[PDB]
Subunit: 294 residues, 3 copies
Amino acid sequence: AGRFTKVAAAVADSVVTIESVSDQEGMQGSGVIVDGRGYIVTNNHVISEAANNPSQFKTTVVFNDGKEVPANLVGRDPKTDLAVLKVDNVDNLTVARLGDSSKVRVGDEVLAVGAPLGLRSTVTQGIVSALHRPVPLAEGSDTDTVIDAIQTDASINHGNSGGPLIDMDAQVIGINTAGLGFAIPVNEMKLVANSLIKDGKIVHPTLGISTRSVSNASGAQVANVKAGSPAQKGGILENDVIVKVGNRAVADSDEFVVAVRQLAIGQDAPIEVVREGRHVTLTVKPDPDSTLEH
Amino acid sequence: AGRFTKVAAAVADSVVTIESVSDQEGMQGSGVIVDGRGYIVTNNHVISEAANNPSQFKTTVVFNDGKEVPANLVGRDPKTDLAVLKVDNVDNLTVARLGDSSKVRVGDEVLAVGAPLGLRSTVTQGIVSALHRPVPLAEGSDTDTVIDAIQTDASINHGNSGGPLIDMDAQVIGINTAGLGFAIPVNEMKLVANSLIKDGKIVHPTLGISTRSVSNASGAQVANVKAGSPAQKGGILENDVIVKVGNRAVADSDEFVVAVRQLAIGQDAPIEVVREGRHVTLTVKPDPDSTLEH
Amino acid sequence: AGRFTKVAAAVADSVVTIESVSDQEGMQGSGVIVDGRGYIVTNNHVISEAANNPSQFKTTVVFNDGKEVPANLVGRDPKTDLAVLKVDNVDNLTVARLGDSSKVRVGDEVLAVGAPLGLRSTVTQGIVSALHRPVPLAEGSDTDTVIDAIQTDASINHGNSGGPLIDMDAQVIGINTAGLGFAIPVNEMKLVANSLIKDGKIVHPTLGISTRSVSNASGAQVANVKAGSPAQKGGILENDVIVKVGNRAVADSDEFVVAVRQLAIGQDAPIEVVREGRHVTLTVKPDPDSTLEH
C-alpha cells in the first residue's frame, strides 16, 4: 500500500458526508467525527443555509459504511467558519485522532481528506505552505470573516471542504475550508468546538472598528469607529493606522481582525497607532460580541 | 535518481507525440504505445479534427528518439474520448506496461506523463483523488460525453493530454484527458481499444433519454424521451426522476449517462423512477447506438 | 522532521524578503543570498518599479532572523527577469548553496521556497515538469521577454516569486518567477548575475526581428524587419518562416526569442528560412542590444 494510501484509508472511517436537503435544494460537505458520543465538526458554510432555515432543511450524516443517520446542529461559528453536529446513539464510531497544529511545520506533507462517499469528494496531497496565515473567508446571511489558517498547496475544494487536513501520523491538524488552500488549525478548532459543545455558542471580542489595509505607515487604517464602542472609549480615531493590537503586529486589515480575536474580553489592551504621522499608543477594553452569551 | 525521475524515464520510450497538420492548422497531443505491432492509444479530442477532415489533415508520430513516422487512424470513440492510431513496420518499439485500474486506490501516487518531445509537454505528479468519478467532457463536431474517470490532483493539461497516467510500478492505469485532473481508467481503455483495433468502432447502448440533474427525489430527471426509443417502450416519462439504472444508483445526469453505458445491449434492465412522488420501477431493453456496427 | 520540512528549514536562512516602499506603494518579493559579501538575487519584476523611480522608492531586506537592512540595486535584466541587490557589511550571512540546473531531470522533486517572513509567503512542492521550456513573461515600463524556464507543478505565486527553486540536496536550481509554474535556471542565473555584479548590466544579442508563431512551414514568421538591422544586412524578409537560429530549431516565436539570445554577439550565424515555400539559409551577425555597454 502506498504511503499516502495507508494514511487516507486509516482515517476514512472518521470522515463523514454531511447533507442538507430541502424541497428544492440539497447541500453537501464533509465532516469529522471528533467525539465518540456522536460529535462531528464541519465548517460553518457547509451547514449555513440549513441553520438559517431549520424549518425547511434536513441534515444527515453518511458514514464510511454507508449508514445514514439524522444529525442535529450543536452550534456554529461563522467567525472561524466552524460548526458542530450531533448524531445520537450511533455505536462503534471511529473517532478521529487529533493532532497539535502548533507542532506543524512548513514543508510537512499533508492530505486534505474528503468524505469517502460524498458526491464529488476528493482526497488531495501537498505540503504546509504557510502557518498563521490570515485569510478572508466569504455564506448566505452570515458575515465574512478572517482566520489564521494553515496554508497548503494540497487542493481545498468542494469535495474535501469540512473534512480534515491530515498529517503523516493520520492525525487531524486542521479542518479544510474551500469557502492555495486553507485549513482552520486544529488547536483553534479544539477551542471553538469545546465551547460549541458546551454552550452552543462561542463568544469573540469586539472593538467596534472597521479597517482597510494600508502599505507605504503600513497596517490597518481605521475606516469607521462605532459610537459607544471600546474604540470610542479608548480614543481611536478615523484615518488612524493600527500597527499593533495587543502583542501582535498588524500587517493589514486581515491580521487586524485576527489580532482582535486573540485579545482578552473585558481586559485592558494596548493599541499602537500612527496618527497624522505620530506614534500614539491607546488603551482599549474589548467587548463580547454576544453580550447575553457572556 | 529521484523516485519520480526513475518512473518517468522508464516510460518515456513508450510515450509519443501525435501531430495533426493541415494547410493552416497544426495540432498536437500525447499518445501511448500499447501494442508492439504499432498500436498507439490517445484520446479522441487530440485527433478529432483530423478524423473529421481526413482529406486536409496529416497525422504523424514522433517517438522518444525523435523518429517521425506516419500514423493512420484505426478507430475512435468520442463517448469515452479514446482513439487508436497505427504506425506500420516500426521496429524495436517499447510497449507500455499496462496496469489494472481496479487495483488503484485513493492516495496512490501517480505521474501524468506527457510526450517527451512535445511542443509544451508536461510531466505532473500527484495522487489519486477519486475513483469511478463521472465527469462531463466537452471537440469540434463530436458530441459531449461523460466517463467514470480516475480523478487526480496531478495537473492534466494540453502537455500531457493523451499520455498515460502512471503508477509507481511504471504501469499505465489511465489515459490523461485535458479536454482537478481526470484520466480514462486503463481497464475501460483496454476494452474500448480491443474493439477499435478489431472493428474500427465501439458500440455503446442507448435508451433515447435526455436528463437533467435534480437534488432535493434526487437523481437524473428526464427532460425528453425519444419517440420509438427503448424508453418509449419501457414506459419512462418526462419529469421522471431516474434514481437507479440497472445495478447502479444514479446521483445525477452525469452518473446516468455512465450508468446507461454499463448496461447490456438488447437485454432487459430495470429503471427505478420517482414519478409525481411515487416509486415506479420500469423495464427497458437498450438499443445499440450504432445499429449497422452491431 | 519531514523530508521536505528538513529541506525547507535548511535553506530558510538563505532566503530573504525584499520590500520596495514609497509614499503610496509598498512592494514585496523574495530573494536569495548568493554571495557572502551581501549579494542577493531576485527577479526583475519584484524591484521593477523601484529601479525605474529610485527617487521615490526605498528597498530593504528582511532576513530570516527578522533583521531589516537597506539594500541597493547592483543591476537588473528584464530580458531574463533577474536582478542583483547588495547589502553592505552584514555579517554571518548564510549563503545559498547553488546547484547545476543542467543536471536537473524531469520528475525531480523540488520546493519553490518563499521568503520565510514575507507578508503572504508560500513554500510549495512538486516536480520538474519540463526543461528548456520557453515561456513569455509580462512589469511597468520594462518590455516583455521569453526565457528557457524550468517548468514545475509546484505552485509559483506572489509568495515565492524571486525565491529559489530548491532540489532535494537543498541546492538552488532556479529562481522562481510568478510574473504551471516557471523558474529561471540557476546556470543562466549564475551567468546573468556574474555580469550584473561586475558591470551592473548584461548585454544580449539582437537581430532587429519581430516574429509571430506559425504552425501548419512551421516556426516563427517574420512580422517586421528593422531598417539597418543585422537582419537587414543578412537578407531576411517579411513573411519568412524562421525554422532554425544557429544550432537551434525554432518551434515558434517564443523559441525564436530564446534562440537569438544563445547566439554569439558580433559573429556570423546561420538562419534557416522557408520563403514562399523555398528553403533559404541566411547569414546574420548579431548586434549587442546595448552598444555602449559592449
